[PDB]
Amino acid sequence: NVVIYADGVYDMLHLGHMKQLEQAKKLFENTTLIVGVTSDNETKLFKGQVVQTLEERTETLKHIRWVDEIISPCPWVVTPEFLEKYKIDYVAHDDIYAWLKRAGKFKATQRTEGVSTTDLIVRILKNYEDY
Amino acid sequence: NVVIYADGVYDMLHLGHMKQLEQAKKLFENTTLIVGVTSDNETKLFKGQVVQTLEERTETLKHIRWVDEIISPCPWVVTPEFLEKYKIDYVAHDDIYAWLKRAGKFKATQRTEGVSTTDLIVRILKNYEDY
């Protein structure tokens, strides 16, 4: 059994997150997938705007079949100490990660374009011709 | 083991669908949850607008841990013949259902207000004061 770790904001969870979580879950035949959900204050300070609170973004992730455990809030920066505390074998994510590639603990997951929740609102608005 | 059936549009799947699916899944200690996804043409003709195609709405549902099987497209009207073909013990849904209450096959699931994907876009727009 292999312990995988993925982290992220997971704001307005869409098929993109789900597919990336699925891919992480399936890196190995027998895995335990831990998902870390970044904090509101830190995501806003370092990355950008978040619609949903930590509590909302977390409650929604618990419905994704690929998720075995959630760390909420997770650290903004993943540390080697953090890997050992939770006995993580691999970190799955789409440099600040060089030390992970060096431990052989880096596993790249892919992003799907064009399926985000915001992409969906755009498709709603395209029913209203500009004139 | 109890076979439960829930149907719906599942457009822009949100925590509301997920919680309603969760509740269906857990009506009994040992269940098999079948989720039917209504067709595009029929949903548009009888109910209202749908952003996502059948194929999109279905691919997203497969990520919800509570879902064991999907019928896609499902019939717009559920029939007693339909219940027997799939050996459904119960139909979970939030009249056109009287015959289900009469078979003792009706199980009511609740809607959560205020967590829909559209509710989320509204919260985005509220950062832009009207003046």
d(CA B105, CA B97): 10
Strands A90-93 and A106-108: what pairing? Answer: parallel
Crossing angle between the packed helical segments A15-25 and B54-61, to the nearest 10 degrees: 40
Contact residues, chain B, for A117 at CB < 8 Å? 12, 117, 120
Classify residue A130 as exposed, middle or buried by CB count within 10 Å of its CB (0-12, 13-18, 19+).
exposed
Contact residues, chain B, for A127 at CB < 8 Å? 49
Experimental technique used?
Answer: X-ray
CB contact under 8 A, A124 and B51: yes
Q: In what order do the strands lie in the sheet with B2-8?
A: B69-71, B31-37, B2-8, B90-93, B106-108
CB contact under 8 A, A18 and B117: no
In order, the DSSP letters of A55-75 are HHHHHHHTTBTT--EEESSPP
- Give the experimental resolution in Å: 2.1
Please count the other Cβ atoms lying within 10 Å of the Cβ belonging to residue B81.
8
Structural domains of chain B, with CATH: 1-131 (3.40.50.620)
User: What are the phi and psi torsion angles at A4 (to 5°)?
Assistant: -110, 145
User: Residue A65's closest chain B neighbor by CA?
Assistant: B65
How far is C-alpha A104 from the chain's CA centre?
A: 20
CB contact under 8 A, A63 and B59: no
In order, the DSSP letters of B44-56 are HHHT---SS-HHH
